[PDB]
Amino acid sequence: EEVETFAFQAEIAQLMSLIINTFYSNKEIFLRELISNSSDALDKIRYESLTDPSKLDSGKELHINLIPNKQDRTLTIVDTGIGMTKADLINNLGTIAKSGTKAFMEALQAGADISMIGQFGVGFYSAYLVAEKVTVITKHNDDEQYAWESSAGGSFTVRTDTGEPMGRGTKVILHLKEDQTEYLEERRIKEIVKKHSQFIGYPITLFVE
């Protein structure tokens, strides 16, 4: 406390189980999905900045940072996008995930594979292909800083983040599974970004250790 615990809607909990328990070797797709979500959040603040330029008072730079940390076994994806309010964070992290899960779970029977997850607007959950726990720190102009967290298992927590303020944006912290540490390696991250994120309209900085 003051930590609020919530149950995932039944379909999202099932989707997370499917992602965690399905044998699927092409795990690298998680990075493309998170970067594309960060790209969308950055387009949103850019669209709002055209009408109201004071939306950029919380930070003018529009970028994506990829931060690996071998000591903590984390891969962090930071964007200075629109960010999420507490309600956005609680409402399936600002999506229609309940309907998207239906169409995706249906498509997986119709011949589709896990790599097509983003076409159903639930690409965020592919983080669970590599992460045993996901922490999302977010700051929206119209709200305070919040930390969302889940190790799956049907629940998630939400608390006010009293940590390092970030002005505006979202930080997706992937606490990697013990067998997924290749995603902490520079050449591996660089290869994935080059393969799946070559035409992202924002600078992508890969931090070094």
Ligand SMILES: COc1ccc(-c2c(C#N)c(N)nc3sc(C(N)=O)c(N)c23)cc1OCCCC(=O)O
């Ligand atoms: C479970 O799905 C998502 C879960 C989280 C996000 C997210 C991420 C990520 N990762 C991010 N870095 N920043 C933001 S700002 C924001 C908002 N204001 O709402 C988001 N929702 C959002 C997007 C998600 O689906 C988007 C595709 C689908 C679509 O087009 O809505």
